[PDB]
């Protein structure tokens, strides 16, 4: 359970930054500030282990990820250089109802912790963590969930990335992938060829009228996992209604009209930092895929077909939920990255990745 009880005293004044820095609460409704945050992340956020790719979250994507129902302006915490007002730090919290084993707790999800490359090792990130903790506590929330590539003490789970090539030649050219150990490039491309049309009957984009049904579908499905979100109708609409270049959700409407399944994946390109011919890698990420009548394998096959039809170069997925049941069959290849999940102020046994039912952007 909780390590420390809900506090009886929380600091009311912001924590002190090092000299030369100032706090700024970012209002992403100001296109100027949203562009500043986009630039910060596009130039300084997470890169692959060999520094060839760097996340390229779009401004619209940041709006989708950072303002779900109940979002708070004070939880978009930025840090600027005082002398020239340049944005050099950021961290964010968004509210969520998170079920850990049997306990449904109001928590925050922490994300987008980023400090400018030139202003690192100045102990800015620890102050950012303290300050977001303070701002969350003052709203009456004392647990958090988050993910990281770094191995910190006592993760609740470790998940592995897998990758399904959709544009093998490009992936090989930019060194995201490599030539098969014993096949020509051409035979590799033939190996990963997908059908031109989906197979599942009744597969169609999600629409507003689907909200409640989708809610019903996900909250039931997620019951089997040890860590998972619990979503109300507003949250379902936010996280799953299609937004072009951001989030795609397809539902399976049975003949009578009931929804029986749905698949979803979000759009998250990577900058290719040093290639003479390629500047970006278009990647889809598996989000939440719920099955009650369609086999999960056919579901994810259709997901791959749709991502391909939409011009994606690769389809990524973690080995959580039931994903291990289709990863190898659908020709995913194991990635070189591990994602750890962590709970703040909650002590509980760790679990396996297939018992993790939470996906963060």
């Amino acid at each position: 359970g909780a390590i420390e009880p809900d506090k009886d005293n929380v600091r009311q004044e912001p924590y002190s930054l090092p000299q030369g820095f100032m706090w700024d609460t970012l209002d992403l409704s100001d296109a100027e500030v949203l562009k500043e945050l986009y630039t910060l992340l596009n130039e300084n956020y997470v890169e692959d282990d060999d520094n060839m790719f760097r996340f390229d979250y779009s401004p619209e994507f940041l709006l989708w990820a950072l303002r779900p129902p109940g979002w708070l302006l004070q939880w978009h915490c930025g840090v600027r250089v005082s002398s020239n007002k340049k944005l050099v730090g950021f961290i964010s919290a968004i509210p969520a109802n998170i079920r850990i084993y049997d306990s449904v707790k109001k928590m925050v999800e922490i994300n987008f912790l980023c400090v400018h490359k030139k202003l690192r090792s100045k102990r800015v990130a620890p102050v950012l963590i303290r300050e977001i903790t303070r701002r969350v506590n003052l709203e009456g929330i004392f647990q958090a969930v988050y993910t990281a590539g770094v191995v910190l003490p006592k993760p609740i789970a470790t998940c592995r990335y897998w990758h399904r090539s959709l544009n093998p030649r490009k992936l090989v050219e930019v060194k995201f992938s490599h030539l098969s150990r014993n096949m020509t490039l051409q035979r590799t491309m033939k190996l990963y060829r997908l059908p031109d049309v989906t197979k599942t009957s009744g597969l169609r984009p999600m629409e507003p009228k689907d909200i409640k049904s989708v809610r019903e579908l996900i909250n039931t499905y997620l019951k089997q996992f040890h860590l998972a979100p619990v979503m109300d109708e507003e949250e379902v609409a936010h996280w799953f209604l299609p937004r072009e270049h951001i989030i795609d959700t397809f539902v399976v409407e049975s003949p009578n009209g009931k929804l029986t399944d749905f698949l979803s994946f979000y759009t998250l390109p990577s900058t290719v930092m040093h290639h003479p011919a390629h500047k970006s890698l278009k990647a889809a990420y598996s989000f939440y895929n719920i099955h009650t009548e369609t086999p999960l394998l056919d579901l994810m096959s259709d997901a791959l077909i749709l991502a391909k039809s939409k011009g994606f170069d690769v389809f990524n997925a973690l080995d959580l939920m039931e994903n291990k049941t289709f990863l190898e069959k659908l020709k995913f290849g194991i990635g070189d990255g591990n994602l750890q999940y962590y709970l703040y102020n909650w002590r509980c046994p760790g679990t396996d990745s297939e018992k993790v039912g939470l996906v963060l952007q």
């Binding site: 997470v46 890169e47 692959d48 282990d49 060999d50 060839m52 790719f53 760097r54 996340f55 994300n111 993910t147 990281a148 590539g149 990335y161 990758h163 090539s165 992936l171 060194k175 995201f176 992938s177 490599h178 990577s270 990524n316 290849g333 194991i334 990635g335 070189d336 990255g337 591990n338 994602l339 963060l360």
Partner: peptide, 7 residues
């Protein structure tokens, strides 16, 4: 948080 590539 993690930008994985094919191993």
């Amino acid at each position: 948080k993690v930008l994985s590539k094919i191993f």
